[PDB]
Amino acid sequence: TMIYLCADCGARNTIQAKEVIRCRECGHRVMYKMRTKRMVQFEAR
């Protein structure tokens, strides 16, 4: 399972694959993903 964000209400919703996407409190129909901890390098140029 993953973690997302309700677009309007902003609540972690923990949906599992092959599911009905919706905000479990809002009824909204859009979810952003959240950026996890990840090690990326960028040159200072």
Binding site: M2, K18, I21, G27, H28, R29, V30, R35, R38
Partner: protein, 1174 residues
């Protein structure tokens, strides 16, 4: 002026919850949203649906020698009203509160902004019960921030709390997430009977003449149609009209006698009431009268029955009800609509025929309808209402035809009183009209049974590319006159002919093909869209000494007065001018009373009215006092001089009013009006180009058309914008030179470019031929640092074939997944890691079919390292569905790379040429390396001396801490602007002409002559790397001819020919020609028969023997069958099994594949070319 910053910062930190800070942006968007508000309120749709009428069906028992066929069960149904509810959640209630749907979810869910459209249906059962019923009619769009959106009047706090950007302007229909918009088009003037001379008229009707009279009449509900008079050489005039894409041609005397039960003497004394027996008119009217007496009838009844029996077939009216009222119906529907009363139609038609004869009489000039004089604007909402009225008329006529079919079958179920019957009928027919609207807004094909008097049927809608704020505005302001005139090649109406002064901008209109057509409205020219009440106007006119003659009378001296299409009376022309004067004074006085303390009664004369006094003059425009009061026109404000208060006027008063443009230019006894400030003349985008009055107008035109494409800040709400390609300029800043209107419109929220210390100098040597340089240190310390956003979407819904249910899903199907790149990028859900850098050959989303159970892949088809910022799992709909759409927003980064065009604000678009190192640049006595070197040889031959002035202004403003006001027309000839800015500079310490001493960089000694250093605003452009470079070493080919494809997305090749051929074949390079045109593109080895000379006839031999030798091709056409004994050598066999003998003359010739394709298609035309070889 000074930089408003403390106000800017305080508005930024906590947005103003009281009122949207910059009101003039709203007054700029006003046209569209006000047209839509006038749709919903002010009774626009209602009048329309009422004027459709009622539509009928019934059981036909044939007349059979009776004539009056009996019919009992007749239903004529009628539409009460139309309702457009607020856009609620998806149509049905779904286990939650039916909540509002702001446009945010419209733009993210990548779907349109729809709302329920309800109709009120009524009955007639050949009686009077008139029971009604509310009908769901599908879903229609709604203009953001209209009287039907959930954002109107919401204060910017409540906007930023939602997902729109603070100074949202609204005005755009959203469709699938691409904000489509209805461009304003230009139409002939409403109700004003104009004249025409255009050659087609006569040679269409050979007895006809170019002399014609056109009038565009419009009902109160804005459902206009045009009916024109075509005059013919004989003397008669035919009364053109157009119905259902069908022309129609009736004589004027006919319709005139049909209208009123009249005496022909009344006809004549109405035509030539004057100066009794003026020879020309009194003979032409005699000829017309005899010509109509020829084959016509006498009475109104007889004529009406003539016309009715004529038209009954094409008119979609009830097949039965009558024939006399059919005549009173045709004169109700087509002849003259804007006039309600019959007698008034009669008077006006007499006016019209008199004016037309005058036009042939040479006493009236040829009106030039292709001028902003006789032109008007069709707003968006009015066209929307008219198309909705038309789709509703179609819907009614369609269910009418359906019930007629039910009556036609035999009589399957026939009880016109029973409701179950009608719910069945409604079940059968398509009951959705909203999707027709949404398709319209998606593409623009206005498909209606009648064109509604609009020439071109297509192109009405344009996407509102938010690329940069100026482009957003100039989408909202602009107009366009139509492709029909565009296709014609002439220096005509594409000319900026001057009756537009303050109506539609003279400078700003794009370069290229549409140049001169789309004229963006001036800064202040509104579009008056809310009509007014004007009955008090006839009251006051007849109170003012002018009375209409009930007894038929008319003299020479008297002229005509008309209130936007209605004969009110007649007047002597001096009285006409005095009436115009007193009326205009009354208008201004009561308006300036309505603003301040005095209470508001119903406005006697509405301010929007433009009193159209047409003076008389020989060989001049025909004089009729024109009191216009309708919306869908242009209206601009000025200050009145005899009073001291506002006054507005439209595109008649310009040509006849002495409008002084400078308070000091005023000459008494003539000048009746004074302009506020001539800044009010230009458009919005053109206005904000400092010193716009020092440049050669082509350069101001370039800078206008090219500022509309700056890589600037497209707003501030970018987290919630799913648009396709967005550009954001990381570090933009306010111009040090800025016309105060640039602060008033509040651009400071939306900067476009940066401020560069530009030293005009030709030193690097690279910066010639209009290019420039870019100081490398500034280029790496963060000069215009572009960021592109490409939001691409993935939709499993489309890729499923058909039949089986929803199959594919996102993620890693139960089973293994590759480690090498997949598990690196894609997290676990098939959705990529947030922020991981992507390179072209790498996956972005992972989806798997259920049957094969094997994960598929889609890689990042862009050819440039992009990042990932946000991935949106677009839920399908109301709910209860899987994630069937992802939206990945890739954040490409684009620093200034050699080739990335830059531009000052005067038309000096260039290239960043070399990025000269910072230490090898020039420098002054102070130490500032000039950041960007422009070229001196570029200022003559372009006349952008305004730029040098801008340099002065900037070096003045930056020093002290001022914001130099650079509106056009401030600085006059007495004291130059140069002198003022120079006084400023010499105050600051630097040279007075702007010069500065600069030592060179690579030699260390000073430049003999000083150099120029200014502080300009370089709004970076948008053409850098995407456009530029495509290389094709080897790649995909064409299905047909094996020539490389036409791409840059499919590695497509570049075209070389049809002039490139002439170039080389002049160079005398036959080998280069044969190489490029043949060798590199399409090369082949093909066999031909030398005996027969055919190329289709070659077949390679099959099953000759075992492995043995190679397949030696042969020719079928020159080979004979295998019957008979022959030697084993020459024989060979066929795939089907046939053996043959002959056809051995097969050689191996090179031949371009396209010729093979030509042989194929040619022989398909049954003709084949026989090529020889020797």
């Amino acid at each position: 002026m000074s930089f408003q910053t403390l106000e800017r910062e305080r508005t930024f930190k906590n947005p103003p919850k009281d009122g949207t800070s910059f009101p003039d942006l709203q007054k700029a968007v006003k046209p569209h949203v006000d047209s839509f508000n006038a749709l919903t309120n002010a009774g626009l749709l209602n009048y329309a649906v009422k004027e459709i009428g009622e539509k009928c069906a019934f059981d036909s028992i044939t007349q059979e020698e009776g004539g009056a066929l009996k019919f009992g069960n007749k239903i004529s149904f009628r539409v009460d009203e139309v309702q457009i509810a607020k856009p609620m959640l998806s149509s049905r209630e779904r286990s939650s509160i039916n909540r509002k749907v702001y446009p945010a979810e419209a733009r993210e869910r990548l779907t349109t902004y729809k709302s329920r459209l309800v109709l009120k249906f009524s009955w007639s059962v050949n009686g009077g019960p008139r029971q009604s019923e509310m009908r769901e009619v599908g879903m229609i769009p709604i203009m953001v921030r209209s009287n039907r959106c959930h954002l109107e009047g919401l204060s910017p706090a409540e906007l930023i709390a939602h997902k729109e950007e603070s100074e949202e302007m609204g005005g755009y229909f959203i469709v699938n997430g691409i904000e489509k918009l209805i461009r304003m088009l230009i139409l002939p003037k409403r109700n004003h009977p104009t004249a025409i001379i255009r050659p087609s008229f006569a040679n269409r009707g050979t007895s006809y003449s170019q002399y014609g009279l056109s009038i565009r009449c419009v009902r109160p509900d804005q459902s206009s149609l045009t009916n024109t008079l075509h005059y013919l050489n004989n003397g008669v005039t035919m009364f053109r009209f157009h119905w259902r894409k069908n022309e129609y041609l009736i004589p004027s005397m006919m319709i005139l006698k049909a209208l009123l039960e009249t005496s022909d003497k009344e006809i004549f004394e109405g035509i030539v009431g004057k100066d009794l027996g003026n020879t020309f008119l009194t003979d032409r009217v005699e000829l017309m009268l005899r010509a109509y007496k020829s084959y016509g009838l006498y009475s109104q009844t007889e004529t009406l029955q003539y016309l009715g029996s004529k038209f009954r077939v094409v008119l979609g009216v009830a097949e039965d009800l009558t024939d006399v009222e059919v005549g009173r119906f045709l004169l109700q529907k087509v002849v003259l609509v804007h006039l309600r009363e019959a007698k008034d139609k009669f008077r006006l038609l007499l006016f019209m025929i008199r004016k037309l004869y005058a036009l042939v009489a040479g006493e009236c000039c040829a009106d030039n309808p292709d001028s902003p004089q006789h032109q008007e604007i069709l707003l968006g909402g009015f066209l929307y209402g008219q198309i909705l009225k038309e789709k509703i008329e179609d819907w009614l006529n369609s269910i009418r035809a359906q019930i007629n079919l039910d009556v036609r079958r035999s009589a399957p179920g026939v009880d016109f009183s029973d409701r179950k019957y009608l719910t069945r009928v409604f079940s059968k027919i398509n009951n959705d009209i909203g999707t027709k609207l949404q398709y319209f807004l998606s593409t623009g094909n206005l498909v209606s049974n009648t064109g509604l008097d609009l020439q071109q049927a297509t192109g009405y809608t344009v996407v509102a590319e938010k690329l940069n704020f100026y482009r957003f505005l100039s989408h909202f302001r602009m107009v366009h006159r139509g492709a029909f005139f565009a296709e014609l090649k002439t220096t005509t109406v594409r000319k900026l002919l001057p009756e537009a002064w303050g109506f539609m901008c003279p400078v700003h209109t794009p370069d290229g093909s549409p140049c001169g057509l789309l004229n963006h409205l001036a800064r202040k020219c509104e579009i008056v869209t809310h009509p007014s009440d004007v009955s008090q106007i006839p009251s006051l006119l007849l109170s003012l000494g002018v009375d209409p003659p009930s007894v038929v009378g008319h003299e020479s001296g008297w002229g005509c007065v008309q209130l936007d299409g209605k004969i009110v009376g007649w007047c002597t022309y001096k009285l006409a001018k005095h009436v115009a004067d007193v009326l205009r004074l009354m208008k201004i006085e009561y308006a300036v009373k309505l603003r301040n303390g005095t209470a508001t009664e119903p406005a006697k004369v509405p301010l929007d009215l433009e009193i159209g006094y047409v003076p008389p003059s020989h060989n001049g425009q025909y004089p009729g006092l024109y009191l216009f009061s309708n919306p869908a026109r242009m209206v601009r404000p000025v200050k009145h001089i005899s009073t001291g208060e506002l006054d507005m006027l439209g595109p008649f008063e310009q040509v006849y009013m002495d409008i002084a443009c400078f308070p000091k230019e005023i000459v008494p006894k003539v000048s009746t009006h004074v302009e506020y400030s001539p800044t009010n003349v230009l458009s919005i985008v053109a206005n904000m180009t400092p010193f716009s009055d020092f440049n050669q107008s082509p350069r101001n035109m370039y800078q206008c058309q090219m500022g509309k494409q700056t890589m600037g800040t497209p707003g501030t709400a970018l987290r919630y914008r799913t648009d396709n390609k967005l550009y954001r300029l990381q570090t933009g800043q306010t111009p040090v030179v800025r016309p105060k209107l640039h602060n008033t419109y509040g651009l400071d929220h939306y900067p476009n470019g940066t401020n560069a210390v530009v030293a005009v100098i030709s030193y690097t040597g690279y910066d010639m031929e209009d290019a420039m340089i870019l100081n490398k240190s500034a280029h790496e310390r963060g000069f215009g640092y572009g960021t592109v956003y490409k939001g691409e979407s993935f939709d499993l819904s489309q890729k499923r074939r058909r039949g089986e249910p929803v199959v594919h899903h996102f993620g890693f199907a139960p089973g293994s997944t590759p480690r090498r790149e997949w598990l690196q990028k894609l997290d676990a859900d098939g959705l990529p890691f947030i922020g991981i850098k992507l390179e072209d050959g790498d996956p972005i989303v992972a989806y798997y079919d259920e049957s094969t159970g094997q994960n598929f892949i889609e890689t990042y088809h862009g050819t440039e390292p992009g990042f990932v910022d946000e991935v949106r799992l677009l839920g399908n709909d109301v709910g209860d569905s899987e994630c069937q759409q992802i939206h990945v927003k890739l954040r490409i980064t684009r620093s200034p790379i050699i080739g990335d065009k830059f531009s000052s604000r005067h038309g000096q678009k260039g290239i960043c040429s070399q990025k000269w190192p910072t230490v090898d640049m020039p420098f002054t006595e102070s130490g500032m390396q000039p950041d960007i070197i422009i070229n001196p040889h570029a200022f003559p031959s372009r006349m952008t001396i305004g730029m040098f002035i801008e340099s002065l202004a900037g070096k003045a403003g930056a020093c002290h801490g001022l914001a130099q006001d650079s509106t056009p027309f401030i600085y006059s000839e007495q004291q130059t602007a140069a002198d003022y800015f120079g006084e400023q500079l010499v105050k600051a310490g630097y040279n007075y002409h702007g010069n500065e001493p600069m030592y060179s960089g690579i030699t260390g000694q000073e430049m003999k002559a000083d150099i120029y250093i200014g502080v300009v605003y370089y709004q970076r452009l948008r053409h850098m790397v995407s456009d530029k470079f495509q290389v094709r070493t080897t790649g995909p080919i064409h299905n047909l001819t094996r020539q490389p494809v036409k791409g840059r997305k499919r590695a497509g090749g570049i075209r070389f020919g049809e002039m490139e051929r002439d170039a080389v074949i002049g160079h005398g390079t036959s080998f280069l020609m044969q190489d490029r045109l043949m060798n590199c593109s399409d090369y082949a080895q093909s066999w031909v028969c030398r005996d027969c000379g055919s190329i289709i006839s070659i077949m390679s031999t099959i099953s000759m023997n075992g492995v043995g030798s190679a397949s030696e091709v042969r020719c079928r056409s020159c080979a004979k069958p295998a019957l008979g004994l022959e030697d084993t050598s020459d024989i060979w066999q066929d795939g089907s099994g046939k053996k043959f003998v002959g056809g051995t003359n097969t050689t191996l010739i090179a031949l371009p594949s396209v010729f093979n394709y030509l042989t194929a298609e040619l022989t398909a035309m049954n003709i084949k070319m026989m090529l020889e070889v020797k």
